[PDB]
Design an enzyme around this catalytic site. Structure first.
Site, mmCIF file in Angstrom:
data_model
loop_
_atom_site.group_PDB
_atom_site.id
_atom_site.type_symbol
_atom_site.label_atom_id
_atom_site.label_comp_id
_atom_site.label_asym_id
_atom_site.label_seq_id
_atom_site.Cartn_x
_atom_site.Cartn_y
_atom_site.Cartn_z
ATOM 1 N N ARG A 163 4.574 -1.031 13.484
ATOM 2 C CA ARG A 163 5.270 -0.203 12.336
ATOM 3 C C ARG A 163 5.656 0.957 12.800
ATOM 4 O O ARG A 163 6.593 1.754 12.783
ATOM 5 C CB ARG A 163 4.637 -0.299 11.025
ATOM 6 N N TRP A 170 1.421 -3.332 4.077
ATOM 7 C CA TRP A 170 1.753 -4.758 4.604
ATOM 8 C C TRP A 170 0.972 -5.622 3.545
ATOM 9 O O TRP A 170 -0.052 -5.609 3.198
ATOM 10 C CB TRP A 170 0.423 -4.793 6.029
ATOM 11 N N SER A 212 0.837 -1.122 -0.050
ATOM 12 C CA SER A 212 -0.015 0.217 -0.185
ATOM 13 C C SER A 212 0.809 1.328 0.126
ATOM 14 O O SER A 212 0.141 2.483 -0.189
ATOM 15 C CB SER A 212 -0.879 0.034 0.990
ATOM 16 N N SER A 258 -6.034 3.134 4.208
ATOM 17 C CA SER A 258 -5.526 2.053 3.216
ATOM 18 C C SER A 258 -6.652 1.416 2.648
ATOM 19 O O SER A 258 -6.554 0.273 2.750
ATOM 20 C CB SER A 258 -4.595 1.211 4.016
HETATM 21 C C1 LIG Z 1 -1.710 -2.233 1.551
HETATM 22 O O1 LIG Z 1 -0.443 -2.492 2.086
HETATM 23 C C2 LIG Z 1 -2.753 -2.926 1.964
HETATM 24 N N1 LIG Z 1 -2.462 -4.399 2.047
HETATM 25 C C3 LIG Z 1 -3.061 -5.413 1.542
HETATM 26 O O2 LIG Z 1 -4.179 -5.153 0.392
HETATM 27 C C4 LIG Z 1 -2.552 -6.823 1.632
HETATM 28 N N2 LIG Z 1 -1.674 -7.264 0.946
HETATM 29 O O3 LIG Z 1 -0.800 -6.553 0.468
HETATM 30 C C5 LIG Z 1 0.192 -6.714 -0.717
HETATM 31 C C6 LIG Z 1 -3.651 -7.803 2.269
HETATM 32 C C7 LIG Z 1 -4.746 -7.524 3.164
HETATM 33 S S1 LIG Z 1 -5.423 -8.872 3.662
HETATM 34 C C8 LIG Z 1 -4.552 -9.689 2.734
HETATM 35 N N3 LIG Z 1 -4.493 -11.126 2.572
HETATM 36 N N4 LIG Z 1 -3.498 -9.267 1.836
HETATM 37 C C9 LIG Z 1 -3.487 -2.419 3.101
HETATM 38 N N5 LIG Z 1 -2.601 -2.447 4.264
HETATM 39 C C10 LIG Z 1 -2.979 -2.563 5.575
HETATM 40 C C11 LIG Z 1 -1.919 -2.132 6.259
HETATM 41 O O4 LIG Z 1 -2.129 -1.874 7.337
HETATM 42 O O5 LIG Z 1 -0.783 -1.511 6.172
HETATM 43 C C12 LIG Z 1 -4.537 -2.516 6.065
HETATM 44 C C13 LIG Z 1 -5.000 -1.884 7.124
HETATM 45 C C14 LIG Z 1 -5.439 -2.684 4.855
HETATM 46 S S2 LIG Z 1 -5.057 -3.446 3.479
#
Ligand SMILES: *C(=O)[C@@H](NC(=O)/C(=N\OC)c1csc(N)n1)[C@@H]1N=C(C(=O)O)C(=C)CS1
Length: 244
Positions: A230, A191, A51, A98
């Site tokens: 983080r 993440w 993200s 996000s």
């Molecule tokens: C951004 O980093 C985003 N992450 C994702 O969509 C996930 N993978 O990313 C390659 C994901 C979410 S659930 C899953 N099986 N895969 C968003 N990142 C966060 C964060 O805390 O950074 C979120 C709260 C929402 S999803």
């Protein structure tokens, strides 16, 4: 002033150790890049941006008139992984939450051909978005190093990216996550869930005096961790160095 570099390095390592993670935080002061943490060799390794790509997605979409900053992206009524995504929101709200579906819609509006040209033009990471416009930052093939992420943060913090000044200011306004004394912290998290999972927090501190200190935290997330680790490691590291 009087704290040894040996002590700073030990303290920042201990923040990653206590989180039971492996990670680095790269700090840039002027042109000097300092690598801290408990897994320093991660600094020039490639990871998906996850993200963190929302910063560049937003710049590309605004610059190319695919959205405005007041535009409300409506929830389509379908159930989300995250129930807080089940609402209508601006790009700025999407940045703070996000909300991946909003950035997927924006990516679809830009479209593959323009997205690939713009990612190549900005020279972001490995510059490869592949054939799927709506998930290339999440699953590959786009990758980036922690050094490249701190250098991107440095470019945006100083309005050095090849976008209008107004475009960069619009996106910077979306990234304010904390104020500590007279410092402001601008950053975007990531993440990459679904092993090994990558966690990011990339941004800069704007100090009272106007100085901007870019940083990029990169660490292995595991099932059971809170996302807020983080933030916690980043804030502890910046406070240890007296940046905040
Ligand atoms: C951004 O980093 C985003 N992450 C994702 O969509 C996930 N993978 O990313 C390659 C994901 C979410 S659930 C899953 N099986 N895969 C968003 N990142 C966060 C964060 O805390 O950074 C979120 C709260 C929402 S999803």
């Amino acid at each position: 002033m009087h704290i040894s570099s040996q002590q700073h390095e030990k303290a920042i390592k201990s923040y990653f150790d206590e989180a039971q993670t492996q990670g680095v935080i790269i700090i840039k002061e002027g042109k000097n890049l300092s690598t801290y943490g408990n897994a320093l060799a991660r600094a020039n390794k490639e990871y998906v941006p996850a993200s963190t790509f929302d910063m560049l997605n937003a710049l590309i979409g605004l610059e190319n008139h695919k959205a405005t900053t007041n535009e409300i992206f409506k929830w389509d009524g379908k159930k989300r992984t995250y129930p807080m995504w089940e609402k209508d929101m601006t790009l700025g709200e999407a940045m703070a939450l996000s909300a991946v579906p909003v950035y997927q819609e924006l990516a679809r509006r830009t479209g593959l051909e323009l997205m690939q040209k713009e990612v190549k033009r900005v020279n972001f990471g490995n510059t490869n978005i592949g054939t799927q416009v709506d998930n290339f930052w999440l699953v590959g093939p786009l990758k980036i190093t922690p050094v490249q992420e701190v250098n991107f943060a440095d470019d945006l913090a100083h309005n050095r990216l090849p976008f209008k000044l107004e475009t960069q200011e619009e996106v910077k306004k979306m990234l304010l996550i904390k104020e500590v004394n007279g410092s402001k912290i601008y950053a975007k998290s990531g993440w990459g869930m679904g092993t090994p999972q990558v966690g990011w927090l990339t941004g800069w501190v704007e100090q009272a005096n106007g100085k901007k200190i870019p940083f990029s935290l990169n660490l292995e997330m595991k099932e059971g961790m809170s996302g807020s680790i983080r933030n916690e490691i980043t804030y502890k590291s910046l406070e240890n160095l007296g940046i905040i």
